[PDB]
Amino acid sequence: SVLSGGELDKWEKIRLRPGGKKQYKLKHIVWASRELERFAVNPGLLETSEGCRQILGQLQPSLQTGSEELRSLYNTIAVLYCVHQRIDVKDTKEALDKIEEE
Amino acid sequence: HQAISPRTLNAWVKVVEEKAFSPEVIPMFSALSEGATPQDLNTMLNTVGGHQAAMQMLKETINEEAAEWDRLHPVHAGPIAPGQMREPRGSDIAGTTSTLQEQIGWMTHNPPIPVGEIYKRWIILGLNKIVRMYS
């Protein structure tokens, strides 16, 4: 599977927006797997830091079009990556920021 | 040395998303794996989502070609000329038991053992079987 019981309690603490009410659910992992598969991309890559990292690099170019088609996927996977990597993040933006400077 | 690029991988899954083991996947597989090391080639294969039975088939492939390479390429006995590389076995060409450094060393040698080209051949053979099954 994608997250361990411990990772899961972390995940479920994290907010979509800074100070926002909506937080990340198991549904967002499931959704992200289904989307990856639609594009013929292996969702098993979500299971590790290195795989998430791979996919972030793949998605980045699309974000540079001005398409937003892959924006939530990218955001969900940026958070995942921080979780896999033990980077505490309270929200998506905090996650994008850590991915910013890496 | 630069590894296969994020955009190349995008081009590669785009092929699969659109063509999926119709005959056309093969020449695009072949052009996109241009200069690939066995490590690049497994990064390609590990990127494919959505085709689990085909990927299993392909890996099974792989393994047959690797066992066969080893049968036809017996290793020479007794230690080698100033450490200038062990001979690759099947699992090394397939990037399973070799190192990027080893893969490159074989690849750049004079004269060269093209472990990427050989691996690409086995994958193409496996993709030919998949295309034949799904046509």
CATH number at residue B119: 1.10.375.10
The number of folded domains in chain A is: 1
* B54 neighbourhood in chain A, CB within 8 Å: none
**Domain region containing A96:** 1-102
Nearest CB to B6: which of A44, A45, A58? Answer: A58
What residues contact residue B78 under an 8 Å CB cut-off, 6+ apart?
Answer: none
DSSP lists the bridge partners of residue A23 as A15
Q: Under an 8 A CB cutoff, do B10 and A58 touch?
A: yes
Nearest CB to B49: which of A36, A54, A61? Answer: A36
Rounded Cα gap, residues A76 and A24, in angstroms? 8
What residues contact residue B132 under an 8 Å CB cut-off, 6+ apart?
Answer: none
**Domain region containing B24:** 1-135
Residue A46: closest C-alpha in chain B: B47
Q: Cis omega before residue A18 (within 30°)?
A: no
Rounded Cα gap, residues A81 and A88, in angstroms? 11
DSSP lists the bridge partners of residue A15 as A23, A91
**Strand, helix or coil at B24?**
coil
Look at the block and give the residue holding tokens 């800074």. A18
Question: Positive or negative, the Cα torsion across B20, B21, B23, B25?
Answer: positive
CATH number at residue A81: 1.10.150.90
What residues contact residue B10 under an 8 Å CB cut-off, 6+ apart?
Answer: A58, A61
The number of folded domains in chain B is: 1
The two structure tokens encoding residue B115 = 């472990």
Resolution in units of Å: 2.2
DSSP string for residues in B81-95:
GGG--PPP-HHHHTT
